[PDB]
Amino acid sequence: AAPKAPADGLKMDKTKQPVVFNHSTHKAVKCGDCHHPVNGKKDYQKCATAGCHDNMDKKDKSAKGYYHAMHDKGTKFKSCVGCHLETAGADAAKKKELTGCKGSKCHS
Numbered sequence: 001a002a003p004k005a006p007a008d009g010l011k012m013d014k015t016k017q018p019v020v021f022n023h024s025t026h027k028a029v030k031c032g033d034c035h036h037p038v039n040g041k042k043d044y045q046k047c048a049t050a051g052c053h054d055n056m057d058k059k060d061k062s063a064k065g066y067y068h069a070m071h072d073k074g075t076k077f078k079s080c081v082g083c084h085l086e087t088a089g090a091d092a093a094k095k096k097e098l099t100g101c102k103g104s105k106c107h108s
């Protein structure tokens, strides 16, 4: 069938700063804006699959840079932090919760 959203509490732990991803709080976002087209087909593999966002150099800005794909603005698909910046706006509490580098819902 079509793929279904997994349960909440999925740990992204390619790095030393792992982050929990909950589908239940992202239902306002289409599946394909994250599980984005690759060669025109939505791809539901893990983001850091080899040949995907598998460069663990957090300084890399190419599409393969994992850090880059999770944190930067101006990306072809919204990143976690990019979309959250737009969502938080001028609301300082939401900026901390959604975009803070520490003491946020991504990074404790």
Ligand code: HEC
Pocket (backbone or CB within 6 Å): 012, 013, 014, 015, 016, 017, 018, 019, 056, 057, 058, 067, 070, 071, 080, 081, 084, 098, 099, 100, 101, 102, 104, 105, 106, 107
């Ligand atoms: C403020 C601008 C932030 C700073 C600085 C960093 N983060 Fe994040 N972050 C997010 C994800 C999805 C990951 C990957 C989790 C995993 O698979 O382990 C990370 C990872 C990091 C790391 C580790 C990089 C390395 O390779 O060691 C650093 C240094 C880091 N981040 C700093 C997600 C999020 C997120 C959710 C929306 C927010 C608000 C932030 N990150 C914020 C920052």
Ligand code: HEC
Pocket (backbone or CB within 6 Å): 003, 004, 005, 006, 010, 011, 012, 021, 023, 026, 027, 029, 030, 031, 032, 033, 034, 035, 044, 045, 046, 047, 048
């Ligand atoms: C971005 C905000 C997303 C939206 C919208 C949806 N998903 Fe998602 N999903 C996302 C992440 C960051 C993760 C973890 C990937 C990681 O690399 O571990 C996932 C994972 C899943 C999975 C499991 C994939 C795997 O481990 O094999 C699937 C099947 C899944 N997601 C499905 C899916 C559906 C069908 C969506 C729409 C209803 C959907 N996702 C939305 C990020 C995001």
Ligand code: HEC
Pocket (backbone or CB within 6 Å): 034, 035, 036, 038, 043, 044, 045, 046, 047, 048, 049, 051, 052, 053, 061, 062, 063, 069, 070, 074, 075, 076, 077, 078, 079
């Ligand atoms: C491999 C099959 C992939 C998987 C699984 C995911 N991504 Fe991806 N991503 C991939 C390619 C080949 C590219 C470039 C496509 C092209 O048109 O240039 C991207 C692009 C991104 C971007 C934009 C990066 C930029 O503009 O520099 C982001 C933000 C991104 N991808 C995020 C993302 C996430 C969150 C994923 C897991 C849910 C994910 N991608 C999977 C290849 C692959």
Ligand code: HEC
Pocket (backbone or CB within 6 Å): 019, 020, 021, 022, 025, 026, 028, 029, 033, 034, 070, 078, 079, 080, 081, 083, 084, 087, 094, 098, 105, 106
């Ligand atoms: C927009 C296109 C989004 C993308 C890409 C990602 N997120 Fe998100 N997120 C978004 C919304 C609209 C909301 C709700 C905001 C509110 O005020 O609560 C969120 C929420 C979060 C949260 C907090 C809720 C929770 O699940 O505990 C976290 C921790 C979260 N989002 C993480 C996250 C990650 C790790 C992403 C990239 C893989 C990601 N978000 C993408 C919208 C959007």
